[PDB]
Design a protein around this ligand. Structure first.
Ligand SMILES: CCc1ccc(/N=C2\S/C(=C\c3ccncc3)C(=O)N2CCOC)cc1
Length: 247
């Protein structure tokens, strides 16, 4: 039970294919938040209307410090609105660009924060797909926040081989993200989609010389072609390299 008139709209926080996300404030409470404006006619054309409803229904039942909270949703004649948590410190992707690459502490901490979020979901029967650093936002204390529509009950980089050839997708992603964090680009980056495909399929990639043993060990184990070879989330959180380096 919300209306556009309940909100003061600030500047845009991001510009998507299906409309912008705006910094917004709730007038009565002065609650600061983000508002995603999706256009109905634009949603129908793409036929994503059902996936969106299903996605919103799943998200709304999710409460974890490392998942961007969806407070609710509403619509008018032409638009659909999603009411989101505001993450003041921008995306991890933007942070990577500025720093080139993260150190082991930041990486390990981020992997911990991620594994925790996934663990919470895995205990509620919720599964995630690939996770891109563009969809990872930062809280006021620099805590990481999964912000995407990839929950269930593009670029190939973050997708595992069992999904591009046609569960354990989550764990593949942590491998990709951990590599990307320490290195500065994801392990299968190519100039064409079709090349990336081939790299993922073969698990063809190398480490730079600065990547340490413990990191090589975790990434290598997470990026196994065979899904049943990949470690459990519990194993990831208790990997020596994680425990030595995380917060
Ligand atoms: C339903 C949960 C959800 C909603 C929108 C999402 N996409 C988001 S959120 C966002 C910016 C933001 C900044 C600070 N605080 C909050 C958000 C942003 O830039 N995107 C991608 C553009 O929309 C397709 C991701 C997840």
């Amino acid at each position: 039970q919300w209306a556009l008139e309940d909100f003061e709209i600030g500047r845009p926080l991001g510009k998507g294919k299906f409309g912008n996300v705006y910094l917004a404030r709730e007038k009565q409470s002065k609650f600061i938040l983000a508002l995603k404006v999706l256009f109905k006619a634009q949603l129908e054309k793409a036929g994503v209307e059902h996936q969106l409803r299903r996605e919103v229904e799943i998200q709304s039942h999710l409460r974890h410090p490392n998942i961007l909270r969806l407070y609710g949703y509403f619509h008018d004649a032409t638009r659909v609105y999603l009411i989101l948590e505001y993450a003041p410190l921008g995306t991890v992707y933007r942070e990577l660009q500025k720093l080139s690459k993260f150190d082991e502490q930041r990486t390990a901490t981020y992997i911990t924060e991620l594994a925790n979020a996934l663990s919470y979901c895995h205990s509620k029967r919720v599964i995630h797909r690939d996770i891109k650093p563009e969809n990872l936002l930062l809280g006021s204390a620099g805590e990481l926040k999964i912000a995407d529509f990839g929950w269930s009950v593009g670029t190939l980089d973050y997708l595992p081989p069992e999904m591009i050839e046609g569960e354990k997708v989550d764990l593949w992603s942590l491998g990709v993200l951990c590599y990307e964090f320490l290195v500065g680009k994801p392990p299968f980056e190519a100039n064409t989609y079709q090349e990336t495909y081939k790299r993922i399929s073969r698990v063809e990639f190398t480490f730079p010389d600065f990547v340490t043993e413990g990191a090589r060990d975790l990434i290598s184990r997470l990026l196994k072609h065979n899904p049943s070879q990949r470690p459990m989330l519990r194993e990831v959180l208790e990997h020596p390299w994680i425990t030595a380096n995380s917060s």
